[PDB]
């Protein structure tokens, strides 16, 4: 049925010493989901996790659909040299009133080549189980 | 201190419907490897694994060193559409004196954005322990 993909924009803000992560959307989510009516969120982790900062984020949950748009931004306080040692982990997760994440697949994105300046990069990433 | 990084070149060859993975070198390997007189190899997986074609590759082992150059190229036979669904999993592994193949760290590289054109990308990728 193919790969599920997530589109993510990334941008560093040197003026404020902060990194922006824009979770845009999922495509071909049908490929990753067998059941019906499920709620989906995306868990975002900036790894390895520095203990003097929040490194774990979760989108709001939305009704599963083959294309699914979140458009949520997450800001992380981090210097550029520190940012370049990091990897971004994003996981598509199923959830219910039990409040247990069932994270069915994800991507990992080395941040070593994030630009210090200029425009955001916006790329599609395959999810792996 | 810092991330160990791997430098990898990627290029699709549409004339022969094949994909090239050039494992160039490790950098700052001392971040992940403290033990002495170890030999190190790079394991390379194109996932998910179409059990027809060959998915798993592995460099020769070399004596561990903070900068470590391999320059090995692995060729994968598959059409661009199939390649566009895959993810590349690379790991830095020791070959212990007792034939343990325990792995120190790795990276995950979505291939969704490899150019059919055959434009050669050469990038550094952080490794997560």
Swiss-Prot record, chains A, B:
Induction section of the entry: Strongly up-regulated by progestin treatment.
Report the subcellular localization: Cytoplasm, Perinuclear region; Nucleus; Cell projection, Ruffle membrane; Cytoplasm, Cytosol
User: From which domain of life does this come?
Assistant: Eukaryota
Tissue expr: Expressed in mammary epithelial cells and breast cancer cell lines. Found in the luminal epithelium surrounding the ducts in the normal breast. In the brain, expressed in somatodendritic compartment of neurons in the cortex and hippocampus and in the cerebellum it is found in the Purkinje cells and some granule cells (at protein level). Detected in brain, heart, colon and kidney. In the kidney, expressed in glomerular podocytes, in some tubules and in the collecting duct.
Q: Specify the C2 domain's residue ranges.
A: 2-125
Subunit description: Homodimer. Forms heterodimers with WWC2 and WWC3. Interacts with DDN. Interacts with DYNLL1 and histone H3. The interaction with DYNLL1 is mandatory for the recruitment and transactivation functions of ESR1 or DYNLL1 to the target chromatin and the interaction with histone H3 ensures proper regulatory interaction of WWC1-DYNLL1-ESR1 complexes with target chromatin. Interacts (via WW domains) with DDR1 (via PPxY motif) in a collagen-regulated manner. Interacts with PRKCZ (via the protein kinase domain).
The record's comment on protein family reads: Belongs to the WWC family. KIBRA subfamily.
UniProt domain comment: The C2-domain mediates homodimerization. It is a calcium-sensitive lipid-binding domain with preference for PI(3)P.
Q: What does this protein do?
A: Regulator of the Hippo signaling pathway, also known as the Salvador-Warts-Hippo (SWH) pathway. Enhances phosphorylation of LATS1 and YAP1 and negatively regulates cell proliferation and organ growth due to a suppression of the transcriptional activity of YAP1, the major effector of the Hippo pathway. Along with NF2 can synergistically induce the phosphorylation of LATS1 and LATS2 and function in the regulation of Hippo signaling pathway. Acts as a transcriptional coactivator of ESR1 which plays an essential role in DYNLL1-mediated ESR1 transactivation.
This chain belongs to the protein called Protein KIBRA
Give the originating organism: Homo sapiens
């Amino acid at each position: 049925s193919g790969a599920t993909r997530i589109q993510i924009a990334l941008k560093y803000d040197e003026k404020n010493k902060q990194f922006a992560i824009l979770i845009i959307q999922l495509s071909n989510l049908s490929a990753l989901l067998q059941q019906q009516d499920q709620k989906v969120n995306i868990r975002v982790a900036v790894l390895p996790c520095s203990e003097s900062t929040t490194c774990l984020f979760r989108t709001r949950p939305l009704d599963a659909s083959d294309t699914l748009v979140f458009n949520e931004v997450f800001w992380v306080s981090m210097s550029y040299p520190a940012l370049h040692q990091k990897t971004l982990r994003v996981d598509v997760c199923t959830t219910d009133r039990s409040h247990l994440e069932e994270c069915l697949g994800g991507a990992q994105i080395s941040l070593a080549e994030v630009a210090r300046s200029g425009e955001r990069s916006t790329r599609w990433y395959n999810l792996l189980s």
